[PDB]
């Protein structure tokens, strides 16, 4: 179980998870604020 | 015939002589190292220039060096 | 009497012929 | 070369549309017999003439192929 | 010796075919020949220069003779806009009858070639009118070729060969080359323009048999000495003038107008005469700087040694560079090639925007051909300028004699130079390719309004500062009361503002997002080619992976597979890699130029402005769209005069691809194959009665790289030339 | 697992039944895309009241030669 | 000081079927090589040119076309088998030349009757720059 926690922190798995989460975040941002060319706030 | 030179940083490990495929190199007695040994290159008219000796030397930088020079029949490795 | 009718052939056919036999005989000659 | 030969030959002399009267119109006009024998006919009548579909797919549902064409060249 | 080649004894004792190959490719590297001195090297180079001069004169002799003999000039002078100039005749016995009919144009009586060098416009502009002028010139060039050869011979015997320290007198040579070679020549050219060509474009035919009896100005040489030069510009050609006629002709010989000639869309002749006179004056005065036999002037070495900033930020400054430059020929050659390359692409950029020749701006194919020719030659010259820097660093550089000056300091922080070049080129590549791909995706999904289209507001501002009024910036020369527009309004500003604000010339074309993106691609190319060449130069004396590289020469295959492997580690190999990037960069540049101009010549500028912002646009609307006529040059239904280009197009595609072989396959495979073949031959009957004299061997490693690269770039040039000429000549518009 | 995916996509995101009704007019399609950044343009009119990506693996032909007539079997 | 052996012809050769990898014209006009060894018994071994041969019990004498062939065969014979070998270079004149091992000992073992050839007494980082040897035919490593 500890060995599993180590394995999950090996480079390919760590990067896979990091980028899947990042992808979900950017996807949802663009689903909420679509077609942005400028910063329309201030 | 290529040129092969031995420099005084040699530690006399003999790894270069074991590697030569044409028997160019040789060990000779010395007094400048713990092994009392040094490499020499008495038969450079048979050297094909493979640098198999340089891949084997452990010193930094190298103690055996191969300078490619004028080509002959033996140097090119021609069987015809 | 047509001028290219003579120069195009010999510069195209015989000049390289003589020059190639020339340079072959020269380059394979041991002095 | 094998797949280019098969693709041009099938369109030129096999595939096409037939009419009720029974006159077969092939996808390409049947130009394999006379244009395949030179290299210029392969460059002109096969590559240049049939790449039109993929270089005109931007804006349609075939635009993914137009993107992959260029990505694969890259 | 006792064999070819004589200069190398090591190659002459080579019993394989290598001996021949390398014999040819080492013939002009004089420093590597057996028993070479300093005097022999210098004298060889001097005679070689003379040989090259003879070559150039014989080539231009050939062009003149051939258009005077098989040419079209006389009919072309009568109507420059409605006749195609002939280059020479075709005699080819493999021709069939339809091709014979197809190539017979321009009014000739048989198959011919149309010229695209632009020599009819140039010779017409400077004065030559009938075939006897061209014959005259050709004979004179033959004479000068022979004289060049004679001098080359004369300066190789004893009794006439100069010493090494004659060749090392730098102040002398610079005085003479500045005031003599550049100033006197420009003065005599101003003379030819004032005496022959300015009259030639006003109806009169001044020649050798009458020129001592024709005034160039109404009051010859009066004004010059009384001081009032202004009288020479008192009556210019009116702006309704017809070039080779008297209708609308003036009398001025020197002016400063700025605009173009209205009829020919070309520079005024009086402007060019006045320009050459002005710069000849500048050169003559400036050629009196350095010191010689007369006890005044400057010592270059003293100027170099006195330029060291206190505070020691440049170390020992320039102390000792006179002898580093004076003693190294590769240093001097690198400098020469760098300066010449920059001014070659300056020639390219100025000859299309400010055409000098009459009726050349209306011949589109010659414009495109000249631009591409000069840009590609400039790129090659740049790669050579950088290669001889690495050769200099290996061969002639002396560390102890340059201790702590600017050069050794360059060597001392090579990591900081390479790292920042690397950062710059990474940044440009990432963002340029990223924006292009963004735009392509946006248009594949049908949303061209979602594009990222940055506007080049700085180049638009600089164009406003020159007097363009398309972006409403109202800055210098585009404002109303600024001293810049105020101080020049009388002399050149009328003509300049009239030309720059016209939109059918190429003087400061309008720009938009597409221009921005392609300019950043050009910047990426320049930065990456510089990175490769600079790294190759600064690492040629040794690096960490091979600290003794200087003991191996400029070019060598590798250091074997030890230490991880050392393929392509010489500085020659950095040059070889950089040639690819040079070709790619000049490709981007010339593609940009040709697409912009071909859409402008068709009145369809919006086509470029809309399709240039995504790469599918370039592929479909430029490459694919403009290829139809070329590839239809011959087809199952016949051939037309584009046939020769349709053929050449394919030649270039073939040669190029053959270059891939030598570049992807390497030596061992081929050597084993050849051993097999040698067995086969020696064993077969009636054919083993024949014996080769050199043992056949595969090519060398460096040799294979060179041969591959040569095929690659030959294919490159040939395919692009065929397409460019056929797609402009087919539309002729 | 790859076969499982093919059959599930034929069963769930496909126009196989309508194609079964009129094979020479409906062009087969067993992949649809989400509307995220305008990419829904890739969901093209493949006929039969359906919008997606036309497939070329020839799976409908196999499923018809097999006797499969409902999505429950897939 | 170690007289070298003589070449004893009439020494038999291994049992081979022939192959297209053997001698060629270079052995007729330029040179070829000859290796000899001991072979306690008859055994099979891989020819350094083609397939497999059978070495005979007693002395063995092979003719090859390159020094590298002889030395690769000798390395195989000396490590995988425990066999002593010597090889020679024969000219078209009919002149032999004992080649290896030169002074009776194998070169990876230091023998007290050897001189130094090609030894520089300094590190490799202390060679002069090429500018120091320009126009004179030496090389920077020559020293
Ligand atoms: C470098 C300049 C140059 C070039 C590129 C050409 C090119 C050409 N010439 Mg031309 N020629 C030239 C100079 C040149 N010529 C000069 C100065 C003269 C005398 C005024 C002639 C007289 C001439 C005639 C009479 C004919 C040609 C013909 C031809 C064409 C057929 C090919 C041929 O037969 O070769 C050229 C054949 C010759 C006899 C030329 C001989 C004279 C030159 C000076 C030879 C130079 C060789 C030199 C030793 C090597 C220089 C090194 C470098 C060029 C590689 C060809 C396009 C033929 C043609 O019109 O085809 C339709 C034709 O019959 N030429
Ligand atoms: C289309 C072909 C191509 C491309 C794209 C490149 C690209 C590059 N070359 Mg190169 N080169 C090429 C052909 C090419 N070369 C050829 C034929 C030769 C002759 C052998 C050379 C020889 C050469 C040399 C000698 C050098 C370069 C250098 C460079 C780098 C320059 C820096 C830069 O522009 O930043 C980046 C630009 C890019 C275009 C990178 C594009 C890739 C992006 C990052 C894709 C992103 C991945 C994405 C997330 C999806 C990944 C998919 C997944 C499955 C992994 C760059 C990566 C120089 C260098 O290293 O600079 C430091 C250098 O020294 N090239
Ligand atoms: C250097 C290259 C580059 C650049 C500068 C851009 C820039 C942009 N792209 Mg693009 N793209 C690129 C490459 C690039 N792209 C490539 C190579 C592709 C092909 C894979 C695409 C495909 C693509 C698509 C399909 C789309 C974009 C879109 C966009 C816009 C998104 C704005 C946004 O996300 O809202 C705002 C996002 C944020 C504010 C994130 C920051 C918030 C953080 C996480 C929180 C921090 C709080 C403290 C933006 C201007 C979208 C668009 O709308 O186009 C107009 C979109 O539809 N791009
Ligand atoms: C006034 C005296 C004088 C003059 C006129 C020259 C002239 C020349 N010398 Mg010399 N020299 C001199 C004194 C002089 N030298 C002295 C005193 C010394 C001893 C210190 C030397 C030592 C010396 C050496 C060692 C060498 C020369 C060389 C040369 C030649 C250079 C190559 C060349 O022709 O390119 C032509 C250059 C120009 C025409 C000017 C440059 C033009 C620029 C780059 C651009 C032109 C712009 C314009 C748009 C072009 C129009 C294009 C259109 C027509 C198509 C040249 C003819 C070289 C040589 O002789 O080769 C055999 C060389 O090796 N000189
Ligand atoms: C190196 C170029 C060059 C050369 C060789 C010539 C040569 C000649 N020019 Mg001339 N000219 C030139 C450039 C040149 N020009 C330029 C650039 C201009 C424009 C300013 C003129 C404008 C010009 C005019 C207006 C006239 C000539 C005339 C002449 C002829 C007589 C000169 C004379 O005796 O005056 C006298 C010489 C001197 C008083 C000594 C000159 C002092 C120098 C610097 C020493 C002569 C053949 C005259 C002529 O009648 O032609 C037949 C004539 O009137 N030229
Ligand atoms: C005034 C310009 C100039 C001069 C005087 C020199 C002079 C010299 N260069 Mg240099 N160089 C230059 C410009 C110049 N270069 C440029 C512009 C480049 C960039 C391309 C280079 C790049 C360069 C490199 C990388 C090297 C030199 C080398 C040398 C030295 C020996 C060259 C030699 O004889 O090898 C022999 C000459 C050849 C092998 C040329 C034959 C092969 C060519 C490339 C094929 C031509 C293409 C084809 C035939 C034409 C098309 C085919 C047809 C279908 C149309 C020599 C001192 C070499 C050297 O020895 O180091 C000092 C060296 O390695 N140069
Ligand atoms: C278009 C590029 C190109 C071309 C033309 C070739 C051509 C060839 N390859 Mg190669 N190859 C290439 C790309 C190319 N390759 C690339 C990119 C790679 C890297 C993977 C390889 C890797 C490779 C390998 C590993 C091998 C070959 C082999 C061969 C040879 C095959 C034998 C043969 O067919 O003889 C016939 C020759 C031709 C078909 C060429 C065209 C013939 C022309 C049209 C005849 C014209 C003659 C003309 C009149 C000459 C006179 C002109 C005068 C001015 C002198 C052949 C010469 C194989 C080989 O050597 O076989 C023994 C070999 O094993 N190639
Ligand atoms: C090689 C087989 C294969 C392939 C290439 C695909 C490909 C695809 N499937 Mg699919 N699928 C498959 C097998 C396959 N599937 C199998 C065997 C089943 C079950 C029988 C399904 C059930 C299924 C469903 C229900 C859906 C898809 C969807 C999709 C599309 C969106 C991808 C996605 O999952 O959303 C995004 C990707 C993720 C959220 C990450 C996936 C992580 C999950 C938890 C499983 C992976 C965890 C792993 C074991 C560790 C995509 C084109 C979706 C679709 O068509 O949208 C319209 C959709 O809803 N598939
Ligand atoms: C219009 C004619 C074009 C040629 C003009 C150039 C010649 C004028 C300058 C030459 C200086 C000679 C220097 C001494 C050089 C000299 O004469 O030394 C004689 C030479 C002996 O060589 P060396 O022992 O002197 O070698 C020392 C070298 O380092 C000197 O380069 O013997 C030969 O002649 C070999 C002949 C091979 C010929 C190969 C054929 C090459 C074909 C092309 C040759 C040029 C033609 C170009 C046309 C495209
Ligand atoms: C490696 C090496 C080498 C080589 C180098 C090179 C090749 C360099 C280059 C470079 C380059 C290629 C450069 C360029 C440049 C440029 C510049 C520097 C410029 C400028 C200018 C200006 C500043 C301008 C101004 C103006 C005017 C006048 C008016 C109008 C406006 C303006 C502003 C535009 C040598 C041999 C030396 C040495 C060894 C090492
Ligand atoms: S390069 Fe090869 S043949 Fe030459 S001495 Fe070294 S190991 Fe022996
Ligand atoms: S490998 Fe290097 S250190 Fe060892 S004996 Fe050979 S030369 Fe000396
Ligand atoms: Ca304008």
Curated annotation (Swiss-Prot), chain B:
Apoprotein for the two 4Fe-4S centers FA and FB of photosystem I (PSI); essential for photochemical activity. FB is the terminal electron acceptor of PSI, donating electrons to ferredoxin. The C-terminus interacts with PsaA/B/D and helps assemble the protein into the PSI complex. Required for binding of PsaD and PsaE to PSI. PSI is a plastocyanin-ferredoxin oxidoreductase, converting photonic excitation into a charge separation, which transfers an electron from the donor P700 chlorophyll pair to the spectroscopically characterized acceptors A0, A1, FX, FA and FB in turn. Binds 2 [4Fe-4S] clusters. Cluster 2 is most probably the spectroscopically characterized electron acceptor FA and cluster 1 is most probably FB. PANTHER family: PHOTOSYSTEM I IRON-SULFUR CENTER, PHOTOSYSTEM I IRON-SULFUR CENTER-RELATED. Residues 1-30, 38-67 form the 4Fe-4S ferredoxin-type domain. Its cofactor is [4Fe-4S] cluster. It is an enzyme of class 1 (oxidoreductase). The eukaryotic PSI reaction center is composed of at least 11 subunits. It is a peripheral membrane protein. [4Fe-4S] cluster 2 binds at residues 20, 47, 50, 53. InterPro entries: 4Fe4S_Fe-S-bd, 4Fe4S_Fe_S_CS, PSI_iron-sulfur_center, PSI_PsaC. One of its GO terms (biological process) is photosynthetic electron transport in photosystem I. HAMAP family: PSI_PsaC (MF_01303). The gene is psaC. [4Fe-4S] cluster 1 binds at residues 10, 13, 16, 57. This is Photosystem I iron-sulfur center. It comes from Pisum sativum.
UniProtKB/Swiss-Prot annotation, chain C:
One of its GO terms (biological process) is photosynthesis. It comes from the Eukaryota. Keywords: Chloroplast, Membrane, Photosynthesis, Photosystem I, Plastid, Thylakoid, Transmembrane, Transmembrane helix. GO terms for cellular component: chloroplast thylakoid membrane; photosystem I. The chain crosses the membrane at residues 7-27. It is found in: Plastid, Chloroplast thylakoid membrane. It is a single-pass membrane protein. May help in the organization of the PsaL subunit. Belongs to the PsaI family. This is Photosystem I reaction center subunit VIII. The gene is psaI. The chain holds residues 2 to 32 of 40 of the full protein.
